[PDB]
Coordinates of C-alpha atoms and ligand atoms in Angstrom, one line a residue:
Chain A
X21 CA -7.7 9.6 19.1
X22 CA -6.5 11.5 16.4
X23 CA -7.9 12.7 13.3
X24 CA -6.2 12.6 9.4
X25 CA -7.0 14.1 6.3
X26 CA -5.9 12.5 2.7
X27 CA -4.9 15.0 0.6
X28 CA -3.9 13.9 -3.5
X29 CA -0.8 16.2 -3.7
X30 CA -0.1 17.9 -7.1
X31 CA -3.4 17.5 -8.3
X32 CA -6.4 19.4 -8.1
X33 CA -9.0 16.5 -8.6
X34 CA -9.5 13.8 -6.2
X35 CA -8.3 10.0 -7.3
X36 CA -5.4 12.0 -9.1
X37 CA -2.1 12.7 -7.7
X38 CA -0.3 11.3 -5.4
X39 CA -1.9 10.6 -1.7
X40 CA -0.4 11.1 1.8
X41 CA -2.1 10.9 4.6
X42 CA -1.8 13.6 7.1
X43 CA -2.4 13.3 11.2
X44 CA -3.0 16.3 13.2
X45 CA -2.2 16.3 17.4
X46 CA 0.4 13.8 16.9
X47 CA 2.7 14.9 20.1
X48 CA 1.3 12.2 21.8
X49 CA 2.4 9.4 19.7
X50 CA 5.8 7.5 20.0
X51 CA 7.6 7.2 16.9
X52 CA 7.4 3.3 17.1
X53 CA 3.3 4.2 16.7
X54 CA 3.6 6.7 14.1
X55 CA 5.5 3.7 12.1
X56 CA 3.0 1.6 12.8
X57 CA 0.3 3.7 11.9
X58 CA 2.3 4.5 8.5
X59 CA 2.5 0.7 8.3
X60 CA -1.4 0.6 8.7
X61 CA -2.2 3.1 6.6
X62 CA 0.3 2.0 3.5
X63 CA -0.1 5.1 1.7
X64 CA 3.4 5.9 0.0
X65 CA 3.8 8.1 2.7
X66 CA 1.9 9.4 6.4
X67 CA 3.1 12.3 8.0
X68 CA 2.5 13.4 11.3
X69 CA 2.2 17.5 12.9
X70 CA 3.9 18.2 15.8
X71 CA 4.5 20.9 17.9
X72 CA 7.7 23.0 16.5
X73 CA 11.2 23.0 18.3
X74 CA 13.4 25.5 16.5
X75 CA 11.1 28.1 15.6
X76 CA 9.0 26.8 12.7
X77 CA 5.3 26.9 12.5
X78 CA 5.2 22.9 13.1
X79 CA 7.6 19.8 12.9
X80 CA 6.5 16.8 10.3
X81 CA 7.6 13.4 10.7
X82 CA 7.4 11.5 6.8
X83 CA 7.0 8.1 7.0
X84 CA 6.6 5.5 4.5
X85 CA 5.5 2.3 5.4
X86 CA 8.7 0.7 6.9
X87 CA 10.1 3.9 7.3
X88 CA 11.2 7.3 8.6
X89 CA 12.2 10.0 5.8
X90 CA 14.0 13.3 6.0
X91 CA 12.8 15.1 3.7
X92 CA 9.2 14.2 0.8
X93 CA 8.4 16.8 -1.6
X94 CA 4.5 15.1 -2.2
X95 CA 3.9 14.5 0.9
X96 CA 5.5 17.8 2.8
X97 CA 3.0 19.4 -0.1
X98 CA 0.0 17.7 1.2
X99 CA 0.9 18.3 4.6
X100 CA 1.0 21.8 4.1
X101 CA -2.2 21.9 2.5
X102 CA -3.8 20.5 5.3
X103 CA -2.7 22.2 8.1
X104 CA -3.3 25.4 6.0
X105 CA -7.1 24.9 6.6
X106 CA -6.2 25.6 10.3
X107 CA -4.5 28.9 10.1
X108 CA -4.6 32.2 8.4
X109 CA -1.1 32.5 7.9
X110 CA -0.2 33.2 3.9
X111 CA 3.0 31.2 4.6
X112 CA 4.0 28.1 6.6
X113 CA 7.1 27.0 7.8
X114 CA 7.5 23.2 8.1
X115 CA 10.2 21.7 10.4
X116 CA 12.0 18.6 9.0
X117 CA 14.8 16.7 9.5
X118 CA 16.6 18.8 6.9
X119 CA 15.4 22.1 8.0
X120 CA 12.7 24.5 8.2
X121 CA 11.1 24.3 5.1
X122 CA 9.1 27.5 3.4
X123 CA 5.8 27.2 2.1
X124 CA 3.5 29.8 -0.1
X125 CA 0.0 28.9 0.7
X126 CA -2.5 29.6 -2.5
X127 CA -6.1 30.2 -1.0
X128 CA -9.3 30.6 -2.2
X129 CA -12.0 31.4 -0.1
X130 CA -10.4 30.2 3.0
X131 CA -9.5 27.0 1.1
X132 CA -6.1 25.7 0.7
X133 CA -5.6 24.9 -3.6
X134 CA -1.9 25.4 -3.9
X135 CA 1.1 25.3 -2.1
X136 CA 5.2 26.2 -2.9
X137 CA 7.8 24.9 -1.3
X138 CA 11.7 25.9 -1.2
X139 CA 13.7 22.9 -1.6
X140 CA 17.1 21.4 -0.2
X141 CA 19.9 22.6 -3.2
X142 CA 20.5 19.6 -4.4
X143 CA 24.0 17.7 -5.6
X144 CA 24.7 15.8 -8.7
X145 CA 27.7 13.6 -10.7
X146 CA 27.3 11.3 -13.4
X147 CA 25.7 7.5 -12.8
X148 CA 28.3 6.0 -14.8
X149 CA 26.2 2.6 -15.3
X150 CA 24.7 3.8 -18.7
X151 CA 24.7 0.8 -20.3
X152 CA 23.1 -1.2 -17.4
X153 CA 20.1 0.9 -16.8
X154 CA 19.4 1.9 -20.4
X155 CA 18.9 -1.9 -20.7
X156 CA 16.7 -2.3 -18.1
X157 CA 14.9 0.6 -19.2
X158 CA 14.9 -1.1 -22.9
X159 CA 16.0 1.7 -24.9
X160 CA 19.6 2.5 -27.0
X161 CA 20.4 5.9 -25.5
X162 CA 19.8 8.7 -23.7
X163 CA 19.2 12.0 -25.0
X164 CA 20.8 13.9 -22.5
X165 CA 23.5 13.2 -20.1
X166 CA 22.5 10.2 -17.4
X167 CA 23.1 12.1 -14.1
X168 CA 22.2 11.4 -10.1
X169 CA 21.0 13.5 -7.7
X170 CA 20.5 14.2 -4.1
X171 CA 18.4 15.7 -2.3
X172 CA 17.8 13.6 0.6
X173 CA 16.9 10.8 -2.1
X174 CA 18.7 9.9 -5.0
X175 CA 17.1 10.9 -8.4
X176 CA 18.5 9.7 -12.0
X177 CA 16.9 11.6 -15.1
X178 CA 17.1 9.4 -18.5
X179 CA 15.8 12.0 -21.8
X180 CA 13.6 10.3 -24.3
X181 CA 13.0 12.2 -27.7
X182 CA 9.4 12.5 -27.6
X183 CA 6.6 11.5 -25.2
X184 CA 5.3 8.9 -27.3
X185 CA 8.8 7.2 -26.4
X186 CA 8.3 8.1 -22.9
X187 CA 4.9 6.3 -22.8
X188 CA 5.9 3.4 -25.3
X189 CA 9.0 2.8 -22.0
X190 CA 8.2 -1.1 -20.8
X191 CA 11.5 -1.2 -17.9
X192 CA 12.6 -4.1 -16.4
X193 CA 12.1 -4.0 -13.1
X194 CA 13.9 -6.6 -12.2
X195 CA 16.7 -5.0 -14.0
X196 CA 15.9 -1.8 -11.9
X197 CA 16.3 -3.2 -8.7
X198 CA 20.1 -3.2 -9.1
X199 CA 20.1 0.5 -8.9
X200 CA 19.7 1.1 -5.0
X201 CA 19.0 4.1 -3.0
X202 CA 17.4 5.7 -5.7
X203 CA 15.0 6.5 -7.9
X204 CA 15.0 6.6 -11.8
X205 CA 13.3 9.2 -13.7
X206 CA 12.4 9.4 -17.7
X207 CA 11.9 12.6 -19.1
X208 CA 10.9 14.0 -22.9
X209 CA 9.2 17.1 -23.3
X210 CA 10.4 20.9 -24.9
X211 CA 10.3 24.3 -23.4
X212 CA 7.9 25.1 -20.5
X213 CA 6.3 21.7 -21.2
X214 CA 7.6 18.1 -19.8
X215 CA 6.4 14.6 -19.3
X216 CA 7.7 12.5 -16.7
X217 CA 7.8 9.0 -15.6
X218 CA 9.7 7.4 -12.1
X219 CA 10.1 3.9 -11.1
X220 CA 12.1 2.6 -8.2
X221 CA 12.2 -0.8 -6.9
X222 CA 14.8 0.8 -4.1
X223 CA 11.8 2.8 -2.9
X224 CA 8.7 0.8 -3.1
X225 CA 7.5 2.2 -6.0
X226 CA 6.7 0.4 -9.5
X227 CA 5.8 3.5 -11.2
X228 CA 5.1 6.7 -9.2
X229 CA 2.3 9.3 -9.9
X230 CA 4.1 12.2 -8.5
X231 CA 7.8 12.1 -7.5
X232 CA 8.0 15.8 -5.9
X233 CA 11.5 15.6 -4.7
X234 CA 12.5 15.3 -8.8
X235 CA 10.6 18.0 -9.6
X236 CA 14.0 20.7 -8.6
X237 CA 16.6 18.5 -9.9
X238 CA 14.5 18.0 -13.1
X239 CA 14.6 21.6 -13.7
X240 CA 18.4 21.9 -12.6
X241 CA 18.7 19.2 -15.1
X242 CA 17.1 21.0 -17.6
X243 CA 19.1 24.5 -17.0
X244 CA 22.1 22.9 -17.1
X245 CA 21.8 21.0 -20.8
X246 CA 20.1 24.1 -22.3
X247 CA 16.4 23.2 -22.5
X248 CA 15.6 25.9 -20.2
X249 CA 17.2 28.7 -18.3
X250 CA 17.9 29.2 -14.6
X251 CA 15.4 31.3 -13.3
X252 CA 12.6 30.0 -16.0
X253 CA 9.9 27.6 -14.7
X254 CA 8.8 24.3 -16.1
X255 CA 5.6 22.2 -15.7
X256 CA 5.8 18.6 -15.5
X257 CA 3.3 16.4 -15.9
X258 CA 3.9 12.7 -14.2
X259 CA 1.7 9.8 -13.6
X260 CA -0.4 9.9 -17.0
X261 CA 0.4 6.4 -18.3
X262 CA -0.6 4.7 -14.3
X263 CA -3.5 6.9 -14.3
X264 CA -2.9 9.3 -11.6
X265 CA -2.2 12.9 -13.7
X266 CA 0.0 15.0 -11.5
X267 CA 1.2 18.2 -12.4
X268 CA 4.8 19.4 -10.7
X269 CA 6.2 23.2 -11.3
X270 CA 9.5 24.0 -10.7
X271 CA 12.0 26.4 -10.6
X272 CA 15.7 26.9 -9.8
X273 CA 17.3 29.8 -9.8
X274 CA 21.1 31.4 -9.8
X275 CA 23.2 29.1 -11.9
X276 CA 24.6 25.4 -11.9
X277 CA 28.0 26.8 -9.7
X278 CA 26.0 28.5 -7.5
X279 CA 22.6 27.8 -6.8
X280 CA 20.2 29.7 -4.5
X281 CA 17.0 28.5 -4.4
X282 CA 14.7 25.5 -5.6
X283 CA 11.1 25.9 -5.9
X284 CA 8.7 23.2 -6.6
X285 CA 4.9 24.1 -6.1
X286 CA 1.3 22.3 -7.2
X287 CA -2.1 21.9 -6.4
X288 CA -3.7 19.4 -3.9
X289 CA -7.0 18.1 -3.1
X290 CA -8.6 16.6 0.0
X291 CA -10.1 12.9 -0.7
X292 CA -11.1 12.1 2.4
X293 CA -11.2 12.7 5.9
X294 CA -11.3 11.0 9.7
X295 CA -10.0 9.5 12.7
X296 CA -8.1 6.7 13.9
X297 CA -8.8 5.7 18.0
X298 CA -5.4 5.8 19.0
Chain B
X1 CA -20.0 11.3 -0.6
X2 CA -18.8 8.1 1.2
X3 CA -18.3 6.9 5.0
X4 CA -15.9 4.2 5.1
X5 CA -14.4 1.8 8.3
X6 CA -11.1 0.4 8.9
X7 CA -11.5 -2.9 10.4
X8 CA -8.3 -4.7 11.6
X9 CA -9.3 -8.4 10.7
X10 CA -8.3 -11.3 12.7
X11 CA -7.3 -9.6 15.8
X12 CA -8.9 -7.6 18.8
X13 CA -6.3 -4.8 18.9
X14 CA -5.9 -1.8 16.7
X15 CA -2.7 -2.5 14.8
X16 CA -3.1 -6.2 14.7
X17 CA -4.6 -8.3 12.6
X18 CA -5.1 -7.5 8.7
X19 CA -6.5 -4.2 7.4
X20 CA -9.5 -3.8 5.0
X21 CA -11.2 -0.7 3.9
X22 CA -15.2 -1.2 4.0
X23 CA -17.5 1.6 2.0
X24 CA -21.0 1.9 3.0
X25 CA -23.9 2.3 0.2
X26 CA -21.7 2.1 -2.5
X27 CA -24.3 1.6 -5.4
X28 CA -23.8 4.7 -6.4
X29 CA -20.0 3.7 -7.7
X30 CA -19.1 2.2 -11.0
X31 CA -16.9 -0.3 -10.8
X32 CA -14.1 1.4 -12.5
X33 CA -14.8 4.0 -9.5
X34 CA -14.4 1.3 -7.2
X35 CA -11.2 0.4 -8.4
X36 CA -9.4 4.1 -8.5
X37 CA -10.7 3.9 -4.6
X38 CA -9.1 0.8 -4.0
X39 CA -6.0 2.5 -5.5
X40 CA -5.8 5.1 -3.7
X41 CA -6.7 3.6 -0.5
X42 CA -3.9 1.2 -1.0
X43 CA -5.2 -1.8 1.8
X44 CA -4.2 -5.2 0.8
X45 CA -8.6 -4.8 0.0
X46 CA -11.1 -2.3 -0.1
X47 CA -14.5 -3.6 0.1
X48 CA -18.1 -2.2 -1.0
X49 CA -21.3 -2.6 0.4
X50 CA -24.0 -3.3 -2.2
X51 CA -27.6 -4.1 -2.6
X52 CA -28.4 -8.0 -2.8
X53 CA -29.1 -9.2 -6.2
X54 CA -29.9 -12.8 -4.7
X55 CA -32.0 -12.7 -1.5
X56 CA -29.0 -12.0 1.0
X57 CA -28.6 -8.8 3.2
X58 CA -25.7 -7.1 0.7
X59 CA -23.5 -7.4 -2.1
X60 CA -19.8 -7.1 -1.2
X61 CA -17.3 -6.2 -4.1
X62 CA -13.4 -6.6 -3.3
X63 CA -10.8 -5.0 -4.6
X64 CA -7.0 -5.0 -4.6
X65 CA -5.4 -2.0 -5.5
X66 CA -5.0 -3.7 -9.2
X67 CA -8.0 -6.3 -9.2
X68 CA -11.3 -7.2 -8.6
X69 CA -11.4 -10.2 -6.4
X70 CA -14.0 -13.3 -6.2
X71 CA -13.9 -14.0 -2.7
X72 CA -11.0 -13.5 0.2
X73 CA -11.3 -13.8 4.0
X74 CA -9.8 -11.5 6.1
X75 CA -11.7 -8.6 4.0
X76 CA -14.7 -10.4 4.3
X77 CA -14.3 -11.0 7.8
X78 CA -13.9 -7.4 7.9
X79 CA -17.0 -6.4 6.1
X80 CA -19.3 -9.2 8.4
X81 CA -17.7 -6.8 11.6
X82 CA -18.3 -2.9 10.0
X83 CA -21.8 -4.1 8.6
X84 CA -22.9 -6.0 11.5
X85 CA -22.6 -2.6 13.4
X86 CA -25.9 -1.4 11.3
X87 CA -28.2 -4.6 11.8
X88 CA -29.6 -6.4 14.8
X89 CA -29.6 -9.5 12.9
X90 CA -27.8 -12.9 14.9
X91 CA -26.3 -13.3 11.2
X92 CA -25.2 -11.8 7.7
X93 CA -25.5 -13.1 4.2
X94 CA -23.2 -11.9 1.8
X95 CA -22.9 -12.1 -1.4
X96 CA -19.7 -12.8 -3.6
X97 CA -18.7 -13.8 -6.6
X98 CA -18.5 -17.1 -5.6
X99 CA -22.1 -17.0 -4.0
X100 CA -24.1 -16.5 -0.5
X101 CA -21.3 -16.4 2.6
X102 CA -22.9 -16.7 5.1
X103 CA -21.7 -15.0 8.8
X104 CA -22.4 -15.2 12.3
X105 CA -21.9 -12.1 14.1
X106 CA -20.3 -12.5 18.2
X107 CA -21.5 -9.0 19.8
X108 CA -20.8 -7.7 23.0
X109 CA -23.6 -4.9 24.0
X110 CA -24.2 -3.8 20.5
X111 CA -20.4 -4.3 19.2
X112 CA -19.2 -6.8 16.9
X113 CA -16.5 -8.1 18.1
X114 CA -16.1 -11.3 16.6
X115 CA -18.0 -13.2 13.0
X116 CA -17.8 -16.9 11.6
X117 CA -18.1 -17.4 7.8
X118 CA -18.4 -20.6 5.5
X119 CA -16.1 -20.8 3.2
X120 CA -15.9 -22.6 -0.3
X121 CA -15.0 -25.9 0.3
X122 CA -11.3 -26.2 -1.5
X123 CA -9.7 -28.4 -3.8
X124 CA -6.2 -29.7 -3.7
X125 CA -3.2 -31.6 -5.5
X126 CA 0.4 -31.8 -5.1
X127 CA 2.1 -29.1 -6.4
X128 CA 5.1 -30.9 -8.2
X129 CA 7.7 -28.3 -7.6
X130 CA 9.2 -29.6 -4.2
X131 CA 12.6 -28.9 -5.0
X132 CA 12.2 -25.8 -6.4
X133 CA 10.1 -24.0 -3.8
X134 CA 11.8 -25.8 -1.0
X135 CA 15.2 -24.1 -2.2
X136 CA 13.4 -20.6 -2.6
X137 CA 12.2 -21.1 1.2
X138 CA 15.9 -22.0 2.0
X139 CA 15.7 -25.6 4.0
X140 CA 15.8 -29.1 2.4
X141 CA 12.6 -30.7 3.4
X142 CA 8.5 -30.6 4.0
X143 CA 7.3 -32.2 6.9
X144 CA 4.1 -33.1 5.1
X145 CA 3.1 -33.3 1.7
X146 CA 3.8 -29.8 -0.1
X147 CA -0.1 -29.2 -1.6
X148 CA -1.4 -26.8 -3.1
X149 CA -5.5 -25.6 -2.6
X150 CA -7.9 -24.0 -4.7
X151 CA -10.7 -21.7 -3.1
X152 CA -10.6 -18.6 -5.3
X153 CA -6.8 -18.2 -4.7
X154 CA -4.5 -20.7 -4.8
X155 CA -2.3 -21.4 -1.6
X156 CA 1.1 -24.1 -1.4
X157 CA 1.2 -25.5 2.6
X158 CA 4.9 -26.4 2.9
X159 CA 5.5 -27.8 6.9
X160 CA 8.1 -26.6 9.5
X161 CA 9.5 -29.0 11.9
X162 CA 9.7 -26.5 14.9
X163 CA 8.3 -22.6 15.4
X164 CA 11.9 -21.8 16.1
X165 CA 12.4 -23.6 12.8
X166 CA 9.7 -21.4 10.9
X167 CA 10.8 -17.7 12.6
X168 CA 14.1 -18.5 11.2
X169 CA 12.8 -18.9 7.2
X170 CA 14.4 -16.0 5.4
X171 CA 13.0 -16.9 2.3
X172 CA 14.4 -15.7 -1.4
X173 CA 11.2 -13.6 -2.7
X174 CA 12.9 -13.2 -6.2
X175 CA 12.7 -17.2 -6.1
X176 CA 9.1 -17.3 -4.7
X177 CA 8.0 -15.0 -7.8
X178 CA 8.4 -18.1 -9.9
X179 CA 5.7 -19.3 -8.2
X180 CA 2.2 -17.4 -10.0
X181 CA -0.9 -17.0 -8.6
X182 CA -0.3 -18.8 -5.2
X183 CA 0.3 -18.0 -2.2
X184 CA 3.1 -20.0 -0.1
X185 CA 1.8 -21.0 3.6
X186 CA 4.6 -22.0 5.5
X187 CA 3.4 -23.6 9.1
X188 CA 4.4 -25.7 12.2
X189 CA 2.5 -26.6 15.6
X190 CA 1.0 -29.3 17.3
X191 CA -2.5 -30.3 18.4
X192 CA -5.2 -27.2 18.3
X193 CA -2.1 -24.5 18.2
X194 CA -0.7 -23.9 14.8
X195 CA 1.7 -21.0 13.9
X196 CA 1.8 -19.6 10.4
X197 CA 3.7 -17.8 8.1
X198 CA 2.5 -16.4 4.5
X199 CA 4.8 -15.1 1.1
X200 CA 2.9 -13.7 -1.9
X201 CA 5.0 -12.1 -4.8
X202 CA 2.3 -13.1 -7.1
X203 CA -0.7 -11.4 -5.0
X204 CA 1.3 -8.5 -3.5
X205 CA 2.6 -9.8 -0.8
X206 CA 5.8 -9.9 1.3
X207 CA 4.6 -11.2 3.9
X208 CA 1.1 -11.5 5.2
X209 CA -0.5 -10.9 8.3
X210 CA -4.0 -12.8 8.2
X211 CA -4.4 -14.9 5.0
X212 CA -8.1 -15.9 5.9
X213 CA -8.7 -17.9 2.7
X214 CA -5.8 -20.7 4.0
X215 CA -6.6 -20.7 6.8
X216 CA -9.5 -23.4 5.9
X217 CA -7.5 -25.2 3.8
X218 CA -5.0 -25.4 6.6
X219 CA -7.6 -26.9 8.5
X220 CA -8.5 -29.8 5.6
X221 CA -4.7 -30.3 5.2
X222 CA -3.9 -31.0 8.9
X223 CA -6.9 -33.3 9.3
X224 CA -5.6 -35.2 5.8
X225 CA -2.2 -35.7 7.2
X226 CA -3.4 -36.5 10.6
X227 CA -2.5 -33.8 12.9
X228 CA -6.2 -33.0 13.8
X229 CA -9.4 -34.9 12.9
X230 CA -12.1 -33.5 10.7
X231 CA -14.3 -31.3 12.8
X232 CA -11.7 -30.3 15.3
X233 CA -11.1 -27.0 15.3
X234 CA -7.7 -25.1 15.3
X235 CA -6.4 -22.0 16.1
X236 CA -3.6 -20.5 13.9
X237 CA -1.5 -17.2 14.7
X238 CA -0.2 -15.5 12.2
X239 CA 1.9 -12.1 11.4
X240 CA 4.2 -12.8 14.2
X241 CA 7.3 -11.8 12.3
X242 CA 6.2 -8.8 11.0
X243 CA 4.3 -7.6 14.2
X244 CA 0.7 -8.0 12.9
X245 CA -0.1 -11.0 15.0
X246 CA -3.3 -12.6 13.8
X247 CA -5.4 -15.3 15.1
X248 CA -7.6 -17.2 13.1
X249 CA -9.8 -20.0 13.5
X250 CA -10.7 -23.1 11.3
X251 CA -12.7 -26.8 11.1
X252 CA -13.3 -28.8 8.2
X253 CA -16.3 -31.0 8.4
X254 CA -16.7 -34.0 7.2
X255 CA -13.9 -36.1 5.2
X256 CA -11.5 -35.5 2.7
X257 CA -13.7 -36.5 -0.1
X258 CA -16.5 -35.5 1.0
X259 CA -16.4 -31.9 3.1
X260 CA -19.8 -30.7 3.9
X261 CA -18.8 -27.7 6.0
X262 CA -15.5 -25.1 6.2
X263 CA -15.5 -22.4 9.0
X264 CA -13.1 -19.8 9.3
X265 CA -13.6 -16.9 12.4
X266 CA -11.9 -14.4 14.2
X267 CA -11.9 -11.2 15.9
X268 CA -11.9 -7.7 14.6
X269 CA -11.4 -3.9 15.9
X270 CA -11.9 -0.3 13.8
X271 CA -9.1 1.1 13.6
X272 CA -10.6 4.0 12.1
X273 CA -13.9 5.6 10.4
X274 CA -13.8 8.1 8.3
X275 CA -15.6 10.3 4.7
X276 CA -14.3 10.2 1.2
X277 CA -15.0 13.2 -0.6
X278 CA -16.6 11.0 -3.8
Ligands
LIG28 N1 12.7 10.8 0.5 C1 13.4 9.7 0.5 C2 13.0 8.5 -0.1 C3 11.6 8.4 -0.8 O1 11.0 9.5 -1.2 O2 11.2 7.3 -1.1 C4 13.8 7.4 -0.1 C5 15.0 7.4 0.5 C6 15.5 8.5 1.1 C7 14.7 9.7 1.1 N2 15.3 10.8 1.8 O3 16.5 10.7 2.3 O4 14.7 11.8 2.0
LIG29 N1 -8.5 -14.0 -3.3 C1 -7.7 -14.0 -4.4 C2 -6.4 -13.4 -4.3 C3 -5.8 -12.8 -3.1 O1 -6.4 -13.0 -1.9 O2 -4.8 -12.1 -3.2 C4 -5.6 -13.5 -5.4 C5 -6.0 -14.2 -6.6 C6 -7.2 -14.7 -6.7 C7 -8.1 -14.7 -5.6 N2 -9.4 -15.3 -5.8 O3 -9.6 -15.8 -6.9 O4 -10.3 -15.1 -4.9

């Protein structure tokens, strides 16, 4: 058997944020299983703690439904939480795919709040299909310059002028599922302070409470077309408009040329807990 | 605080079958609270056990992650097996939207293993879109009449000639979202073994595993174009394709126009048990 814990990542409230489900012990499953009990489970994504192999504290396996993943900022965040109920370490280093990933953990009382993570330095070029996806999105223009980036996904950032634009946005989705591999992400906000929506047909997702892996290139984003500065953090708040409130921070320091690191950090939440008999 | 169940419905084997979400003494939920649970679960249902308001045993409420539901089978399958673990009684009366289900519970030294339910008896008509749906499904003909049944949802019966013939449907799900609130029941067999196959872009649904509310109507529609007689029961597996085999079992009583009885059973397993935090 094997126990799990939900965890809402970026929120600090249960039945906010954005689940994952999180199974402990997991050495013993075959990755066919751990797909099938991500299947069972359909949570946007289940991760699963192993033992470590180069090093780390643990490996985690990300799995959405149908299937494995690289690298999750949300649900790496939750998994990090959760396992930092089981030790006293102040920091946690997660094995992935992509690396060993850092962790801050943010205790109080024994309890896990908080967690920051240092993200994969992500790349980025222009979309080039403007006119396409502003379409499907329903608006004329973008405020700032329509660019992709990667991280392990594929993130696009689209600028509305104010959040009442952001919120008014009605896309296509439809339209949307021509854009594949990736997900697309509407911003509007000013100075520390940013709204965010993401949908993605390629991914699963109509609209997303709390799209953690954008969180870094938003703020990259953001340095880069003067909003903010390298080096300066931003809070983003995701999710409002579908009811799950998720707050993201992020941070990304050095400059566009030569980046060297990418925080994203956020609160998270247990919602429930048990075990599963296999 | 919460306990809750996961009950695979319609098989015997964790990973099988149909997932629902059951949550014990729930009169302490609104049902906006209900919903955000549903949500964040993200089951095909979550279901919530309720005081009687009508002389049965309990009240179920089902949700999707978006909507309240009337009635639906493999969650209230599911319910019949979590509950019946708390009673000693031979059977369960639940109540619905639609009115008094009533169950009768199969144990094995204290274990439900197994429950029968009575479902509401269906109407039918042609659908009148033969050409249409039969081109979304990709293949030129029905081997019987393409109807469509009304028992709370809304589900088309479209017949394969072979279950070579229906493994090999690859249908177009941007075609089949024409097609509102229905589900599409594609099928083939002979005698008391039937194969299934269920598409849903209207309720959700790629493709189902368990689809407990056709499987009645299946039943009536068989009988009608005289595959089976009325009051023979069939078995009919399901999921195959997508690896959540399913087996359900159905009888109509009666005649066409005038039913007096539909049964639907089938197995189910917990998968897991655990505590929500609300
Ligand atoms: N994290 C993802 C996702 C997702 O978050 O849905 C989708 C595709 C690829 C990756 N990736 O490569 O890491
Ligand atoms: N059970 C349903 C479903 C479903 O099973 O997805 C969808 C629409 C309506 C009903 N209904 O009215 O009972």
């Amino acid at each position: 058997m094997h126990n799990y814990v939900i965890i809402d990542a970026f929120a600090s409230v249960p039945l906010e944020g954005n689940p994952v489900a999180v199974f402990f012990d997991a050495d013993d499953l075959p990755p066919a299983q751990m797909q099938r009990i991500a299947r069972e489970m359909n949570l946007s994504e289940s991760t699963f703690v192993l033992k470590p192999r180069n090093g780390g504290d643990a490996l985690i396996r990300i799995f959405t439904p149908v299937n494995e993943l690289p690298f999750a900022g949300h649900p790496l965040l939750g998994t990090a939480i959760a396992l930092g109920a089981h030790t006293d370490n102040h920091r946690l280093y997660l094995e992935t795919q992509m690396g060993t990933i850092a962790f801050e953990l943010e205790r109080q009382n024994g309890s896990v709040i908080a967690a920051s993570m240092d993200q994969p330095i992500p790349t980025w070029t222009a979309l080039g299909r403007d006119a396409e996806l502003l379409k499907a999105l329903g608006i004329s223009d973008s405020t700032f310059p329509i660019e992709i980036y990667h991280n392990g996904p594929r993130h696009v950032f689209v600028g509305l002028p104010s959040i009442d634009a952001l919120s008014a946005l009605h896309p296509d989705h439809r339209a949307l599922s021509n854009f594949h591999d990736m997900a697309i992400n509407c911003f509007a906000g000013a100075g520390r302070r940013w709204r965010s929506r993401m949908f993605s047909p390629a991914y699963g997702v109509v609209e997303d409470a709390a799209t953690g892996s954008a969180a870094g290139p938003l703020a990259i984003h953001l340095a880069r077309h003067g909003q903010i500065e390298f080096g300066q953090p931003v809070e983003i708040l995701q999710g409002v408009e579908i009811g799950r409130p998720s707050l993201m921070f992020a941070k990304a320091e050095g400059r566009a040329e030569q980046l060297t690191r990418v925080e994203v950090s956020g609160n998270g939440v247990t919602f429930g807990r048990g075990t599963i008999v296999l």
